[PDB]
């Protein structure tokens, strides 16, 4: 017959190879597909829709609906902080279990700009401004409104608009950042400070609520597929 | 199926074969390369730049900076020798640990012309000449300026130029010479003698310094890749 | 600008789904010690035993994948007094029973000598036996989630288990007897290829409990932290 | 993969077969041949030149 020769790597089962196989049942007449609506062709199309972030996750608010319920109130002196978290999707325990976070955890690299959207669910007669600021990693973390005004920020009035979009820009030395975040590929800090106040006419409740959604922009991409460190089991389910 | 037949040499792992393999992670999006300056495409481009030879390696000068510090001085009678070594790069312990020498030791054959460059680091008011001579192997080694004038030589004044280039020509019976030098493929002897003197005006120090660099010319080439007999280890580094 | 880059090739459906994921670990022997680890084991085909592949499929509501089934069949020698015995190589059989067909009621039944049910014979030492099956369904997609009942009276069985009739899979040793008992382990590796996934679904938070329903325990939405506003200079 | 089938006569070492092999040292730069005089291309060219026969081979 034809003289062949066996290269190393034969009679092995790599779980990520791309080979053909003999079919078990041949000449099968499959059922014709129909126009089922809403077909998805990529995993980033799931990650480009919003999902409200559990920012107020101080214990034990995570067992209730109060995890999504960032509180604001009329102040005494301005410039105070509202909330703040690190920009570590997939690792920081604020935006880890959101819809963007559960998709990066099947991967080991991410890159691109994230989009934060807010929604002030207060009264229709209250008015106030905020200072939502992104800060590059550098050194260090800002501890004042005077410090977190030099970075990237916007100013959001709640008497004019109810929703504000903050495109967090991609600033890094590398082309990708690791999902399980180490010290080398840092990403920075998101903070939100009182610009003026919350001012309200009489007979309105004081404490209000801000929702916060996270999404992905168009330049978002992920790499190096892996399995998620969320599910665990030992024996087979019965 | 197709009738094949297994030639001898199958299911073997030669460490220097050239075969394809199934990829472990497919459809990988690699990072785009940038214009990092100074790209090297051959090992001889490293070996064509100079590196100062430790000629004065008499013990224990190799543990200091005095190994590169060939001394000259005003003489009493002329014709004396300055230095001298064998032309065995990769094996002779003068030009073995230079930049040309550490590259031949990854190989088992060399061929081509070597280039020796000098640099007189003396005073600006001193004057003198030297006789830098290459001698073919033959028989034997010269022991006088009268004997090492019949071979290839140049005459180098230090009052005119500070740097002299001596292209050592390739004279051999074979096309290649072995790096681990045996008796059959000899290469010859490099010597350097006083042509006139070192003459200096008053209030100048006597003992001066000559540096010596070794390089490769354009017709240099190496063959028969091997591993270097310089590094050694027994257990894995931890 | 910067011009840009980084195509989303690994975020695709087929690159995310096509990986040989183990779905069931079948266990059988030669000498019957007890049940289980009896000779002649079986397994009705479902993809909801292993939590790794189950969570991947349950981010989409309807799937239309083909399959690639691979077995990694290794055998260990059972503990006894002596072990010294020359033995011929073990031959293994994996028979696929379609939904409704006749089953082997025991070992040495003539259902292993049938003419329609496909079977894969394989001796120990070679490459793993890999075979492919097409899109086995009666609807037009694989319902991962079916919110309804089995009977028209709204009774009987709640869940997706009514729309799961993929068949069975029967494992046995072909060889008649060994001099000393040998326990074998067969691992089924599904690989979904030619995938079409329609309705996206929010991913599972709390870990599964059973292989037939979506019953769960209450878990908080995320891990906690100390204070809401982080602070340092 | 491609379905093949092993004809008898495989994994055998016949000492007079004509097959290719993976090279141990690849990209070797061999030395250029020179015009060495008197090249022979056949064993009968040796056998077509004379050689004096030991006819008187009676001992000793």
């Amino acid at each position: 017959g034809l003289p062949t020769m066996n290269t190393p790597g034969s009679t092995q089962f790599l779980t990520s190879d791309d080979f053909q196989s003999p079919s078990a049942m041949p000449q099968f007449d499959v059922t014709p597909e129909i126009q089922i609506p809403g077909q998805v062709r990529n995993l980033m199309e799931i990650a480009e829709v919003d999902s409200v972030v559990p920012v107020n996750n101080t214990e034990g608010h995570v067992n209730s609906m109060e995890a999504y319920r960032i509180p604001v109130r009329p102040q005494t002196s301005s410039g105070e902080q509202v909330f703040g978290f690190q920009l570590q999707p997939g690792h920081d325990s604020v935006l880890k279990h959101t819809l963007l976070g559960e998709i990066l955890n099947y991967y080991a690299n991410w890159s691109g700009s994230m989009k934060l959207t807010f929604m002030y669910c207060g009264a229709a007669m209250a008015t106030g401004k905020f200072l939502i600021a992104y800060s590059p990693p550098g050194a260090g973390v800002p501890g004042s409104r005077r410090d977190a005004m030099l970075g990237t920020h916007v100013i959001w009035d709640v008497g004019l608009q109810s929703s504000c979009v903050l495109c967090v820009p991609w600033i890094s030395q590398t082309n990708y950042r690791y999902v399980t975040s180490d010290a080398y590929t840092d990403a920075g800090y998101i903070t939100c400070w009182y610009q003026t106040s919350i001012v309200t006419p009489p007979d309105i409740p004081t404490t209000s609520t801000i929702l916060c959604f996270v999404s992905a922009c168009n330049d978002f991409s992920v790499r190096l597929l892996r399995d998620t460190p969320f599910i665990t089991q030992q024996a087979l389910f019965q | 199926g197709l009738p094949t037949m297994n030639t001898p040499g199958s299911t073997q792992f030669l460490t220097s074969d050239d075969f394809q393999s199934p990829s472990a992670m497919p459809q990988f999006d690699v990072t785009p390369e940038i214009q990092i300056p100074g790209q090297v495409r051959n090992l001889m481009e490293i070996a064509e730049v100079d590196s100062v030879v430790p000629v004065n390696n008499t013990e224990g000068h190799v543990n200091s900076m005095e190994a590169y510090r060939i001394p000259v001085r005003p003489q009493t009678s002329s014709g004396e020798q300055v230095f001298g070594f064998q032309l065995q790069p990769g094996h002779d312990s003068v030009l073995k640990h230079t930049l040309l020498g550490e590259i031949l030791n990854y190989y088992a054959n060399w061929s081509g012309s070597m280039k020796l460059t000098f640099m007189y680091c003396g005073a600006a008011m001193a004057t003198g000449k030297f006789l830098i001579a290459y001698s073919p192997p033959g028989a034997g080694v010269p022991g006088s300026r009268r004997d090492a004038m019949l071979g290839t030589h140049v005459i180098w004044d230090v009052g005119l130029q500070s740097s002299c280039v001596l292209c050592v020509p390739w004279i051999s019976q074979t096309n290649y010479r072995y790096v681990t030098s045996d008796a059959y493929t000899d290469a010859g002897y490099i010597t350097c003698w006083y042509q006139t003197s070192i003459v200096t005006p008053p209030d100048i120090p006597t003992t001066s310094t000559i540096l010596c660099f070794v390089s490769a010319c354009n017709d240099f080439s190496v063959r028969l890749l091997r591993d270097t007999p310089f590094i050694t280890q027994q257990a894995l580094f931890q | 600008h910067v011009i840009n880059y980084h195509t989303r090739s690994e975020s695709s459906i087929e690159n995310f789904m096509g990986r040989a994921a183990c779905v069931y670990i079948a266990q059988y022997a030669t000498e019957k010690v007890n049940d289980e680890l009896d000779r002649y084991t079986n397994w009705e085909i479902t993809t909801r035993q292993v939590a790794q592949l189950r969570r991947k499929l349950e981010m989409f509501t309807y799937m239309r994948f083909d399959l690639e089934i691979t077995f990694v069949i290794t055998s260990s020698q059972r503990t006894s007094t002596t072990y010294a015995s020359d033995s011929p190589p073990l031959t293994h059989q994996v028979m696929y029973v379609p939904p409704g067909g006749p089953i082997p009621k025991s070992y040495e039944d003539f259902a292993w000598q049938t003419s329609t049910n496909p079977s894969v014979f394989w001796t120990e030492g070679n490459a793993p036996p890999r075979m492919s099956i097409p899109f086995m369904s009666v609807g037009n997609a694989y319902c991962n989630f079916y919110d309804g009942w089995s009977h028209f009276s709204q009774s009987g069985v709640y869940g997706y288990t009514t729309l799961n009739n993929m068949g069975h899979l029967y494992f046995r040793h072909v060889n008649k007897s060994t001099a000393y008992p040998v326990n074998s382990v067969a691992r089924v590796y599904f690989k979904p290829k030619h995938v079409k996934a329609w309705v996206p679904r929010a991913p599972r938070l709390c870990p599964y409990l059973k292989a037939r329903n979506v019953n769960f325990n209450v878990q908080g939405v995320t891990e906690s932290r100390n204070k809401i506003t982080l602070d340092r200079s | 993969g491609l379905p093949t089938m092993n004809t008898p006569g495989s994994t055998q070492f016949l000492t007079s077969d004509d097959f290719q092999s993976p090279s141990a040292m690849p990209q070797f730069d061999v030395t250029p041949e020179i015009q060495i005089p008197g090249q022979v291309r056949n064993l009968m060219e040796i056998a077509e030149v004379d050689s004096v026969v030991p006819v008187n081979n009676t001992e000793g």
């Binding site: 791309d18 003999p22 079919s23 099968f28 | - | 492919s132 097409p134 030619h194 | 491609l2």
Partner: peptide, 17 residues
């Protein structure tokens, strides 16, 4: 990327890449 098909079935093919 030779892209030849040895078998007669569609479900016996390789992945779509």
């Amino acid at each position: 990327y030779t892209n030849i098909n040895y078998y007669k079935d569609s479900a016996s093919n390789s992945l779509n890449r």
